[PDB]
Amino acid sequence: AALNQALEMKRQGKREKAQKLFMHALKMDPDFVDALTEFGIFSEEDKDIIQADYLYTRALTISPYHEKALVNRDRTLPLVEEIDQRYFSIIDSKVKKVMSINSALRRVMEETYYHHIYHTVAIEGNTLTLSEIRHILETRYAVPGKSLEEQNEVIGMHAAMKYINTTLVSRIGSVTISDVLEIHRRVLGYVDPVEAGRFRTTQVLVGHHIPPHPQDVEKQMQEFVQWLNSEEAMNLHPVEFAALAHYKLVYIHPFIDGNGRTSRLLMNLILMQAGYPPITIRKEQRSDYYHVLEAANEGDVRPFIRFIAKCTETTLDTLLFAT
Amino acid sequence: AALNQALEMKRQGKREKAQKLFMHALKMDPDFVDALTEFGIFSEEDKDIIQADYLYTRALTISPYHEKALVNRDRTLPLVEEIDQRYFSIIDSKVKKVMSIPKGNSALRRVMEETYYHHIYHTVAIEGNTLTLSEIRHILETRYAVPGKSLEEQNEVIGMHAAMKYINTTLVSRIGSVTISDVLEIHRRVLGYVDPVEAGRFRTTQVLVGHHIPPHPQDVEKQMQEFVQWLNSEEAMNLHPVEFAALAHYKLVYIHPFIDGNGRTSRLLMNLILMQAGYPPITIRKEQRSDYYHVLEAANEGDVRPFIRFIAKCTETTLDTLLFATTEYSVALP
Ligand SMILES: Nc1ncnc2c1ncn2[C@@H]1O[C@H](COP(=O)(O)OP(=O)(O)O)[C@@H](O)[C@H]1O
Ligand SMILES: Nc1ncnc2c1ncn2[C@@H]1O[C@H](COP(=O)(O)OP(=O)(O)O)[C@@H](O)[C@H]1O
Ligand SMILES: [Mg+2]
Ligand SMILES: [Mg+2]
C-alpha cells in the first residue's frame, strides 16, 4: 500500500519523508502487520529500540506467526526488558540522593504540594491558577469569578491528601476497598457529597473505552485490592506497581467522577509507602497521558509504565535541583 | 424576699417597677414558688393569661401542693388550652387562603421563589452565616463563588438547596413511614459540602449545647429509633400539624444526633411535616434567634408550649407575608 512508497523513500533517506508515509499508512490501518514490522526496522536505524519493539509487538498481536516481526521480536524482547530494568535502577539512585538528605528541601515540598493539586485538577479543565489554589487552601476564602465546583475540587484534593499522608502512608497492613472509598469520599465529597464514597450505579463511555458494568464494579475492585496485597504485586518495582495500580483503577472506572484523581493518589500512596516522593503528571502531558492509556487498553501497558517512570524521574530531578 | 417589695409596690401601681422586682427575684431564684404565683397573678391583671399560666405551671412543678398556684392553675389550665386551640384554627383559615389560589398563578409563583431564597437566608443566617440574600441568590443561580466570603459559608448554602430539592422532590409526595435513613439523607445534603466525612452519620462524641448535655453518642441511635417511631405513631398524626412539627423540631434538637447541622435538619424536618400536611414552609427569621433560644430553654426546663406557640407565630407570619405579597403582585405584575 503506502508502505511501499515509504520503503522506497526509506532508501535514499528523506527519512522525515519516509516517517510521514509510515505514519499515514498507520492512520489508514493501525493493524497493518507489514507496516508495523517494517516501521520497527526503520525505528531501530534511529536507535529507537523501545518503539521498534512496540511495533513488532503490535504486529505479532495481529499476526502471531509473521516471520519478519518474530525474528526481530525475539531479539528485542529482552533487550527492552533490560533497557527498562536499567531506567528503573537510574531512578533508584536519584531517589537515594533525595532520601540521603533542611532549609530548601522543606521549602520544595510545600511548593510541590500546591503544584500537585494544580496539575491533578487542571488536567481535566479546572481553570484555577496555582496562586488561587494557594489562596483557597491557605485563607479558606473563596476566589472571585471562579466556579464553586472548581474550588471544591481543590478542597477535596487537600482533604484527601491530608488523610492519605496522615492515616494510610505510615499504616501497616492490607490496602482495603474501604480506604479507596475513604480517599474518594474526601476527593469528591465537597463537589458531590451523595456520590462521593460509593461506586458507579450507571454504565458510561470514557473516550473509546466502556468500563465494567456497574453490576461488575464491586467484584472487579475486590480483585483489584486482592492484587494490591498480592506477593506478585509487592515483587514488582514500586514504579511499575504504582503505574499498574493507576491504570487498573482507571480501567475499572469505579466511580462516576474523580477516578483519575483517586488513581493518581493511590499511585502516590503505593510510591510513598515504598519511600518515593509523590509524583505529578503535569497539565501539559494530557495528550501523552491519554495516548499511553490508549496503547495500554490496546494491549501494551509498558509505554504507560514508562510514562510514569519519566514522571518519577522529572519529579526527582526537580527535587535535586534544590542542592 | 425581694417579692414583698414587688407585692407592696404592686399595690399603688408602679407596675413597671413591680415587674423589675418580680424579674430580679426570679433571677436570684427562678425556682421560687411564691414569686412565680404572685407574678402569674400580676401577669393576669395585664390580660396575660398564657404567661400567668406558665408561672403557675412552673410553680406546681417545684411545689405540687401550693394552694395559691393550684386554684389559679385549675382556672387557667383549660382556658389556655382553648386560647391555644383557637390560635391554631386561626392559622388554618390563613392556610386555606394560601391554598385557595390557583397555583399556576403568576403572582404566587414569584412569591414562592422569593420565599425559597429567603428561607435559606434565614436558616443559615441564624447561626452567623454572613451571606446576604443577593449573595445566596447568586451562589445558587450562577453557581459562581462570591468574593471575600468563606467557602464554608457558601457550601452551607449549596447543601441547604441540595437538601430542600431532595425533600421537595423525593419525600413530600412519598407515601409511608418517615425513616431514620431519610433523616440521614437530609443531613448528607445539608452538611456534605462542608463536612463530607461527618454528613449522614450520627455523633461519635459527647458535647455541650449551651447549658444542655444531649444523649451520649452511644444512646443517639436508640433515641432516634424512638423518635422515628413517634413520627409514625397515630398519637403524633392526631396532633395538629403545627404542634406535631414544633415537637419534631424540638425532639430532634434535644437529641442533637449530629455533630453539626442539627438545627437546619430540624427546621427542614419540621417543614417536611408541615408540607406533608398541606402547609407552606415556614421560616424562623435571624432576628428571632434570642426568642428561639429562650423557648428552647423553657422547653428543656419542662414546658414545650412556648416553643409550640413560637412555631405557630412563625407559621402565621409566613402565611401573612405570603398572602400580602401575593396580593401586592396581583396588582403590580401583569
Ligand atoms: N480511554 C480511556 N481508557 C482508560 N481510562 C481512561 C480513558 N479516558 C479517560 N480515562 C481515565 O479517566 C480519567 C478521567 O475520569 P474521571 O472519573 O472523571 O476522573 P477525575 O474526575 O479525577 O478527572 C482520566 O484521568 C483517565 O485516567
Ligand atoms: N441549649 C439548647 N437546648 C436545645 N437545643 C439547642 C440548644 N442550643 C442549641 N440548640 C440547637 O442546636 C442548633 C445549633 O446546633 P448545630 O448542631 O451546630 O446545627 P446548625 O449548625 O445547623 O445550626 C440550634 O439551631 C438549636 O436548634
Ligand atoms: Mg473528573
Ligand atoms: Mg453549627
Numbering used by the authors:
A (entry chain B): 108 to 208, 212 to 433
B (entry chain A): 108 to 441
What did the study's authors say about this model?
In addition to apo structures of HYPE variants, we have also obtained structures with the ATP cofactor bound to an E234G variant and with ADP bound to either the HYPE E234G variant or to wild-type protein. The position of the inhibitory glutamate (Glu234) in the structure of wild-type HYPE is consistent with its role in competing with the Arg374/γ-phospate interaction. Interestingly, there is a difference in side chain orientation of Glu234 in apo and ADP bound structures of the wild-type HYPE that shows that this side chain can also affect ADP binding and that is sufficiently flexible to accommodate bound ADP. The position of clearly visible α- and β-phosphates in all three structures is the same, with the α-phosphate present in an orientation compatible with the AMPylation reaction. Correct positioning of the α-phosphate in the wild-type HYPE/ADP complex shows that also in the case of HYPE, the γ-phosphate, and to some extent β-phosphate, could preclude efficient and/or enzymatically correct ATP binding to the wild-type protein. Wild-type HYPE also bound ADP (as the only ligand), but with a considerably lower affinity and KD of 1.5 μM, possibly owing to electrostatic repulsion by the side chain of by Glu234. Binding of ATP to wild-type HYPE could not be detected using these methods. These findings are in general agreement with the structural data and with the previously proposed role of the inhibitory Glu in obstructing correct engagement of the γ and β phosphates of ATP. Our data describing the cofactor binding, where binding of ATP to wild-type HYPE is obstructed by the conserved glutamic acid residue, raise two possibilities.
